[PDB]
Design a protein around this ligand. Structure first.
Ligand SMILES: NC(=O)c1ccc[n+]([C@@H]2O[C@H](COP(=O)([O-])OP(=O)(O)OC[C@H]3O[C@@H](n4cnc5c(N)ncnc54)[C@H](O)[C@@H]3O)[C@@H](O)[C@H]2O)c1
Ligand SMILES: NC(=O)c1ccc[n+]([C@@H]2O[C@H](COP(=O)([O-])OP(=O)(O)OC[C@H]3O[C@@H](n4cnc5c(N)ncnc54)[C@H](O)[C@@H]3O)[C@@H](O)[C@H]2O)c1
Lengths: 546, 534
């Protein structure tokens, strides 16, 4: 009764979060970052599409601009045409079986090696490219392009290696084993401008699980995205496993959703784009060899809710960070603040005072900068329209900021607005700019106002409650259960850390597959269970039939 | 929570279980149950009266039920939504208790009832009802309860001065559970697993499995399931799909059935995306065109008994049933002779009256008609030859004899299309073309559900396993392609066969939770500035 299939013991991996560096004066990391920033000043990188190991140029030339100095073209790249995208698909599919058959531990090694490169010798590079290309300050680049990306790679490797140890029960005369197959076909990874790490995860997590990927990075994050790609290849990712294919968005979506071999879309960005892709897949359902898996994390209209028992200083600092870091360009950024009347004079005074101290400027040249320009001309225009709405709306008053200037960079000052109307459109719609709206509620209506927090918007991403009263915290936690997939008690609504706050939310905010947690990788495997029986079968009849 | 598989009973003469089953069968002979829709605790009748017939004696109406209209379905949604928050807030263990109690009831005092209702209402024999309505259903309930309670123990890293905790929220909205005729247990799982995870559910059972489905429902309610957590709402299929996909509160569809129906629901959801409060989650397990592939080194007796069981048990009405057998020329005289001899001994008849019955009538007139079309095709096609069987008679029951067909064309439509009847097609390949034929096993059909290789050569088994990696989500070496057991062979497959969420394994329940992570910080936050800025 010898076993013809033999299964090897599965190993474990010890990982921990990547430490955040301090960038203190004279420190090696501060010196290295300054050098890398100097290396990028006045430079434009010509970034090709990469299919297999071939650098390919099309005639559709595009430029990435430095948000705080838009005269500086930080990258010249090109959009893959439909022909090149289809060639990339074919090549990826031809490489898939071998990659899928590789031991999980061997695929994981690529990402572990990449993580170590990012941690050490390439840290300054990816930080600097994120600063110059996406407009991040030192610490915003550090938490993103270094820590979060490194953590995705290490933690997902751990989760994936350990997943193979999740095996079914065997009873004589049979042995059962689960094979965690990659998905059959190719995955389209479509990433947003605002986090370098998200691009790496969107393309990298499916690849880890044995998939092949067409990665269309965000135009406005091209420089750092390519840096990450090159690191993966240097770390040993074989050719045709991730195709680096910048492209016109609609063109890319049209092409991948037209392929019979599409098996997944891993998306992060706006709701309408995700819905469009979902509908395109549904329209073409009959052509696909299998049912494609769509993962999408989208926007939020996130709240900080203050109870009268709150620590005022914590409300102020936490809210300033959440609303204004990276110019409020986070899916998790606080954009609505609910304050009880009893605390409003104290909080208003402190917000206005601290507001006056916030420095907006060039993050490469002035490390005193709290945040810099927003990402591009389109973002600037949208934010400007909202500022104009605030000035025109009788229910809205600008308390601080309101200025903007796109002469050199896409600069918008932090803006604090008070709304007398808790249902004003500005309380509902995601601006993705440094624009905080405050609604002041009477203390005696806190319960009713909690219902407003829950019902006002279509989103369910992040939210915080500031309160020191335990009963109130318990009550608010119950009431806001579905208002936030990442919920915070006495901390700011941003800054989720891999393995500590797995990230995502529902309602209109996406599919909530919790990248950063141990279950995310399951979306990118389609398990097979093998049963081997070690003894001859008996008769087809059963004894009870006699 | 520690859990083991429910024993499969032998039903020997004089055994407690055989005596109890015979009594339960006697209790049901000549009976018609009037089965209402159940919304909350309200038993509701509409004018749209329907009947479930006994497949092997269709003059016997085993149940009278009714279709919920759009208005009733919408009231059921409203009532379920109003009950959801409290249920979702209940500790996982408290919800699990309902299913553990239900499992104990099914194992013991209600075992004979659910078996008998599955036999009389769906046409199963004793052992097919036993592995389904008892063992599989009990196992779904016990194993999913274990998986769910243990999932709560999966928690994130906390680092001072913050504590992090994951709350495994149910999905916000209601889940539509749409179950098939062929397994009583699948209905229980499709409605039960989401409910376990804090969801509320509109369950539309299969018309042709109504009697046993309602029995399961009542057991859940008696086991402590509160009102409005699972609504028991038989309905016309299209009416149900239209109604649930039209609700802004739809958050999931848990489906098992045909590919076209699942695709239709998928498209309806996509059409209505802008109306939904969140993105609904669709889970669908659909059909298969499953293979048994034989290498020349195979144990012939195992091939023969395993294939007869896989192809013909429950009339081949399994998503996992073998319908294409590939045999090397060198073994064909043996396998052909044995299949045809054993075929002559297969008893098709009344499973309640004759425990000697191997399998009974197919489920309904529509299935009978579809299968007859395939038999007529086999008589027409120049590449197909009926080797044994081919008879069918719907005068008393929907009776189809087991049929064995040889195809000279490995790509014939009968080798590709799911028949869901007791119809086995055999392709004989030259021994030296074994690798080419393995490739054909993989490339011929659109499906990826189950398959088996029979071989006693290690290198061949290893090669075949690698080559057929995506041809079967449940793959078997030297065993039949049916009969997955919860916790041992989590079940499902890809290609056209569905979403492959592996019910019966530890990860299935994750489709029915939308986690929230709570971070609590225990010290004041300090300045908004950072040190490097100074
Ligand atoms: N929930 C999260 O984890 C998360 C994280 C980051 C950003 N976001 C969200 O992303 C949004 C801002 O980012 P954005 O500007 O890049 O959004 P966006 O939808 O405009 O673009 C996102 C990506 O989709 C691409 N794209 C656009 N149309 C496409 C199409 N038809 N087919 C294929 N790809 C297409 C873009 O080129 C880009 O790469 C915000 O709503 C923000 O909240 C969410
Ligand atoms: N992969 C698996 O695990 C698995 C298990 C059991 C059965 N099946 C498959 O089920 C199929 C046969 O079962 P079937 O006869 O019930 O198929 P079916 O798709 O016609 O019906 C299944 C269910 O869907 C309902 N239905 C039909 N149209 C609907 C609509 N528009 N909206 C909502 N509900 C609708 C039916 O009433 C029934 O309850 C086979 O293909 C078989 O392979 C698969």
């Amino acid at each position: 009764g010898s076993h013809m299939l033999r299964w090897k013991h599965t190993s474990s991996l010890k990982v921990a979060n990547e430490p955040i560096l301090a960038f203190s004066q004279g420190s090696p990391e501060r010196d290295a970052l300054q050098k890398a920033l100097k290396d990028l000043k006045g430079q434009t990188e010509a970034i090709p599409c990469v299919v297999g190991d071939e650098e390919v140029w099309t005639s559709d030339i595009q430029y990435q601009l430095s948000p705080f100095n838009h005269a500086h073209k930080v990258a010249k790249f090109c959009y893959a045409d439909k022909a090149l995208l289809n060639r990339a698909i074919d090549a990826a599919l031809a490489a898939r079986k071998e990659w899928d058959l590789k031991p999980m531990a061997d695929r994981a090694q690529v990402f572990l090696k990449a993580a170590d490169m990012l941690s050490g010798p390439r840290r300054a590079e990816v930080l600097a490219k994120t600063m110059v290309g996406q407009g991040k300050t030192v610490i915003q680049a550090e938490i993103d392009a270094a820590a979060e990306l490194i953590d995705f790679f290490r933690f997902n490797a751990k989760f994936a290696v350990e997943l193979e140890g999740e095996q079914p029960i065997s009873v004589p005369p049979s042995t059962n084993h689960t094979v965690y197959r990659g998905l059959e076909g190719f995955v389209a990874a479509i990433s947003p401008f605002n986090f370098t790490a998200i691009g790496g995860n969107l393309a990298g997590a499916p690849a880890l699980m044995g998939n092949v990927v067409l990665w269309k990075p965000s135009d406005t994050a091209m420089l750092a995205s390519y840096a990450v790609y090159r690191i993966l290849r240097e770390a040993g990712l074989p050719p045709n496993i991730i195709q680096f294919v910048p492209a016109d968005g609609p063109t890319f979506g049209d092409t991948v959703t037209s392929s019979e071999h599409l098996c997944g879309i891993n998306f992060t960005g706006s709701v309408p784009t995700f819905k469009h892709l979902w509908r395109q897949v549904a329209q073409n359902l009959d052509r696909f060899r299998t049912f494609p898996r769509l993962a999408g994390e989208c926007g939020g209209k996130n709240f900080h809710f203050v109870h009268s028992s709150a620590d005022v200083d914590s409300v102020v600092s936490g809210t300033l960070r959440s609303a204004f870091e990276y110019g409020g360009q986070k899916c998790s950024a606080c954009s609505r603040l609910y304050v009880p009347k009893s605390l409003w004079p104290q909080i208003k005074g402190r917000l206005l005072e601290e507001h006056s101290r916030i420095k907006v400027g060039d993050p490469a040249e002035d490390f005193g900068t709290f945040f810099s320009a927003v990402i591009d001309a389109k973002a600037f225009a949208r934010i400007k329209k909202w500022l104009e709405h605030a000035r025109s709306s009788p229910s809205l008053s600008i308390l601080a900021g309101g200025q903007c200037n796109e002469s050199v960079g896409y600069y918008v000052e932090p803006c604090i607005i008070e709304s007398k109307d808790p249902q004003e459109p500005i309380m509902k719609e995601e601006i993705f700019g440094p624009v905080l709206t405050v609604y002041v509620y009477p203390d005696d209506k806190y319960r009713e106002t909690l219902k407003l927090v829950d019902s006002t918007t279509s989103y369910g991403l992040t939210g915080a409650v500031f309160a020191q009263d335990k009963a109130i915290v318990q009550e608010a936690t119950r009431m806001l259960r579905n208002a936030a997939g990442n919920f915070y008690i006495n901390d700011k609504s941003t800054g989720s850390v891999v393995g500590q706050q797995p990230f995502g939310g529902a309602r209109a905010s996406g599919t909530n597959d919790k990248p950063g947690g141990p279950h995310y990788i399951l979306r990118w495997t389609s398990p097979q269970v093998i049963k081997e029986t070690h003894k001859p079968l008996g008769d087809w009849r059963y004894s009870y039939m006699q």
